Amino acid sequence: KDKEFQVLFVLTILTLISGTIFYSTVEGLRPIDALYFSVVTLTTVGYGDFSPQTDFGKIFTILYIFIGIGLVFGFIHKLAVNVQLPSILSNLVPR
Amino acid sequence: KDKEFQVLFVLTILTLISGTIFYSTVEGLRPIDALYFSVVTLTTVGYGDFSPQTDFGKIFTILYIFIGIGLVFGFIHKLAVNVQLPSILSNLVPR
Amino acid sequence: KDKEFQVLFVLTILTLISGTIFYSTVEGLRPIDALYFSVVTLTTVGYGDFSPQTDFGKIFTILYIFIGIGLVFGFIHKLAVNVQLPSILSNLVPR
Amino acid sequence: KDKEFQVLFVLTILTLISGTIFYSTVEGLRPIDALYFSVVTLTTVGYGDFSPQTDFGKIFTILYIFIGIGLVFGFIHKLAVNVQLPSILSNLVPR
Ligand SMILES: [K+]
Ligand SMILES: [K+]
Ligand SMILES: [K+]
Ligand SMILES: [K+]
């Protein structure tokens, strides 16, 4: 279960690095903005303060969403159930 | 399970084609933008760089969301569990 | 299961009517725009082509989201599993 | 189950207070706008009428989303199943 978490963590980082490199390069964003945009996209928040302007970028974004959402939300689920929940329970019992 | 995936894949493509034809025609978008907008809508990202301006478009979008979200997210779930997950597991074991 | 669906359908309509009346009145939107905005909000798409400008509207929106998401997505789930899925299966078998 | 709900309720309030203090301070928002923005972010609506403009804010938002979504949606789930659903069932049976 901690190996579950480690693998999803690594896969999430790799997915976000991919988006960061793509949007910096093709859409001209600063790397920090490309990372922020990738996260805002795959978590489905979608502020729209950044959005792709090129057709290459729009096509990549379609594929990136379909491939990336399942992973990101898998990681969020495991983070909440396997890390946050036990730490919350631990705080309820003094030692 | 591969037939599960094939059917949801075909249904997702048909749903996206419907949106592409509607928004190109009624809202005047380029076909690639109409496809991109349909995906950004049904995955609930919603950047808002495109949004419907006509009342016909707003009404269609209401119905398209309610009909389309369940399918799209069904496909994403099956993609992640039935395709991405086994390929990830396969990479962990050399042959 | 059809009574499950009927009840969630009615509750979803009532929830959307509430939002339509509120945003038309307090935020000055046309009724069709208030309905469209309510749907775009509770399905979490959030284009931002409309958003509340008054403090009353921002406060209402906070509460409306927390109360409304669970219902709307309950209805979407039942629509997809109890209505769309059987109709899709029915199309695969000629009579 | 009512203690389940109480704990998630308190944790949700604390999470929203954190965001309210951060975005008011670093991004200069009025407290009510910072609260509204925090809710619009963690429920994944993401209108984009507010969005972070500083790099500190963008970095915080990335972490806030990953930590906050699992909690918020846990609370929404329990609200809908453990509070809204029984009250709806209660209305169907006069006394
Ligand atoms: K969303
Ligand atoms: K959005
Ligand atoms: K969104
Ligand atoms: K937006």
The domain that holds D56 is classified in CATH as 1.10.287.70
Residue recorded with tokens 């069904």? B74
Residue B50 falls within a domain, yes or no? yes
Cα distance between residue C42 and residue C59, in whole Å: 15
Residue recorded with tokens 């809908």? D80
Residue C23 falls within a domain, yes or no? yes
Helix (H, G, I), strand (E, B) or coil at D46: coil
Cα distance between residue D29 and residue D41, in whole Å: 15
Cα distance between residue A66 and residue A78, in whole Å: 20
Determine the distance in angstroms separating the CA of C95 from the nearest CA of chain A, rounded to an integer: 36
What single string gives the DSSP state of each residue in D16-44? HHHHHHHHHHHS---HHHHHHHHHHHHTT
What is the number of structural domains in chain C? 1
Residue B19 falls within a domain, yes or no? yes
Determine the distance in angstroms separating the CA of A23 from the nearest CA of chain B, rounded to an integer: 16
Among C3, C58, C60, C78, most D C-beta atoms within 10 A, so best to mutate, is C58
Residue B95 falls within a domain, yes or no? no
Q: For chain A, how far is it from start to end, CA to CA, in angstroms?
A: 25
Query: Resolution in A, one decimal?
Result: 1.6
Residue C94 falls within a domain, yes or no? no
Tell me the one-letter amino acid at C56: F
Residue recorded with tokens 């209402």? C60
Minimum-distance CB partner of C41 among D45, D76, D88: D45
Cα distance between residue B61 and residue D64, in whole Å: 30
Determine the distance in angstroms separating the CA of D19 from the nearest CA of chain C, rounded to an integer: 14
Could you tell me which chain C residue has the CA closest to the CA of D45? Answer: C44
- Which approach determined this entry? X-ray
Residue A20 falls within a domain, yes or no? yes
Residue A78 falls within a domain, yes or no? yes
Residue B5 CA, ligand 3 centroid: distance in Å: 26
Domain of residue A24: give its range: 2-89
Cα distance between residue A48 and residue C46, in whole Å: 10
DSSP secondary structure code for residue A43 in this structure: T
Contact D28, C51 (CB under 8 A): no
CB atoms within 10 A of CB A28: 12
Residue C95 falls within a domain, yes or no? no
